Design a protein around this ligand. Structure first.
Ligand SMILES: [Fe+3]
Ligand SMILES: [Fe+3]
Ligand SMILES: [Fe+3]
Ligand SMILES: [Fe+3]
Lengths: 201, 201, 201, 201
């Protein structure tokens, strides 16, 4: 029998990330938008299931475009919540292998922090900055994802994620995306990113 | 010291896939286009390396958009070559777990074959049909990738790939993409796809 | 000598559109975001001018992609302001030829209103619903623009425009884009749209 | 009663553009692909008409995305045929106002030719280089359209168009898009482009 998406609980209370992300900001991002991608993806799964059980045609171009949108939404918000936490337990900079790779690939943490920040700030409209890793060339890559599913390298795995959809910050920072991106570095959970990085060597 | 992309050898001689993909068709896809993504990705890596060594600014929005394009190109062609082979060793349909999942998720191999074929045929302009798998809901998904990097679900891994860029077939089939997609099923290497599928349970 | 973009004045005071769009909502959409597209487009124009004067190379792929983004932003906000006004002077439904075309192409105003509304609501992330007209087939078309420049038919002219970027409504309606879309019909300036429609027969 | 798209005749015989575009190349671009956009756009028009007559729901997101694709295809191929012709009647460079604008905006015809050529060559996958004009700033712009409908500035009108979809050249030039772009300048119909430019001042 079939299985579906559910809204994951946050790792922490809705006010865990203040003053950097407000309780109000966090609550509605999680409960309205992230939820919308859960429901989006599920509605579509049922649609495709139905067509298969009745052996009828669907517009799969439309279906798969939409599916990639919502599941991308679901997946990115999932990692996003996971690589933040309380400021007094988080922020700072990473250590261990991740630290070493950020050095060799970017020259310094500062350089990284800055490039990753430009990737977030400069995104045209809705999107994300995402850190990932090429196995093949043994290099950390940044990608700038538009929406939840545009300009992404298939098959590459997520290390660090920063939502820069307007819904993620407009309540706390209105238009001023750079202040939000700057606040973000106070609540990055490097432990989690470090862990993620280790499971792909 | 730094590391770069190289054109992978084919698993087989350039005429291994006739009459379905011609020697001419295969040779230029591999040696011109796939090569172009190698060089694209490498030029860009060097560009970013240079900016880091001289600690200067780059347009990283442009850079990362381009990077995702070429590395996507590189990665998809890599899996593409790998899940084809000689018709007399390949084609048919899969077995084992992959077979079981295709049944439960699509109802039958036929249904799958057909949906995957629509995903390839109906792609607007350059792109791919790609099979993948959601861990979370335990379901095979198809995605329809435009170019090498549009409408893809970040973090999802590649099982099966079908290039449907015009360069992949125009020599052998001109405009008639459906005949090319139909020929493809004669040379799918299910062993390889089966193996890929097992390494993500 | 060269010429550049400037932020157009609104046709009306920042509180002219209350209670449907608040003075706060309108002021920052206009003065922050619309402004940002002005500056984006100008920065880029100067960049291209400089390269031409020094007869040096630019990355024109990147340049033109960005240019289409900002100028699209500029152009769409320009028509957007223009086809709204005070509720007590606007809203209602159109008359004259536009009314006749909406009937013959959509069957009724209701149908139009509803389709246009789905086009706005359902847009994935940032984008617009835009009414336009095919000369060739003599039909009103709706297009759903993502960002400012995606999924638009080149050469077709703007009649009616509804911003559905989250910055357009998040202050007044937070996540609830449908309430914003619904409010919009209270402040549509049909006179303006009617006029626009007449200048392309 | 309703009206639909039809495949326009070429302004000239299928061998009119040799040796630069071959009779074979031209015939299949026109009769297969351009035709496909005609049928695509018509199928969709009927779909939307049916839903309106039966007052039923459609997926208008999907519909309008697809519509913009095919009508864009239709419109761009229409202008494309129109701004080419026989080499011995065409090519060269433009004169009159267009010539003057190309000078003041690009510095020279060479610069223009070169930038326009990069816009064509560098397009990632299927797309177009298109010349157009901003009324507001009184400047010629180039845009790089992906597919038929991506990265285009809404409302701007078409002056000059170069198809760089692989189907436009793969028969004559295989992978070597630069040779095709170079050949193109031999058959540009500047009379037509000049005329187009005059009708928007
Ligand atoms: Fe979000
Ligand atoms: Fe290819
Ligand atoms: Fe806006
Ligand atoms: Fe074409």
């Amino acid at each position: 029998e079939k299985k579906f998406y559910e809204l994951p609980e946050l790792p922490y209370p809705y006010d865990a990330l203040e003053p950097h992300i407000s309780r109000e900001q966090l609550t509605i991002h999680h409960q309205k938008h992230h939820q919308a991608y859960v429901d989006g993806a599920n509605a579509l799964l049922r649609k495709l299931d139905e067509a298969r059980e009745s052996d009828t045609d669907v517009d799969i171009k439309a279906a798969l475009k939409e599916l990639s949108f919502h599941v991308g939404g679901y997946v990115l918000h999932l990692f996003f919540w996971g690589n933040m936490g309380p400021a007094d337990e988080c922020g700072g900079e990473p250590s261990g292998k991740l630290a070493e790779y950020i050095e060799k690939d970017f020259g310094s943490f500062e350089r990284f922090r800055k490039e990753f920040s430009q990737a977030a700030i400069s995104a045209e409209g809705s999107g994300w900055a995402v850190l990932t890793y090429c196995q093949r060339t043994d290099r950390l890559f940044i990608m700038q994802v538009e929406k939840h599913n545009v300009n992404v390298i298939p098959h590459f795995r997520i290390l660090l994620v920063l939502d820069v959809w307007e819904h993620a910050y407009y309540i706390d920072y209105r238009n001023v995306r750079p202040d939000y991106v700057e606040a973000f570095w106070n609540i990055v959970n490097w432990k989690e990113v470090e862990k993620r990085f280790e499971d792909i060597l």
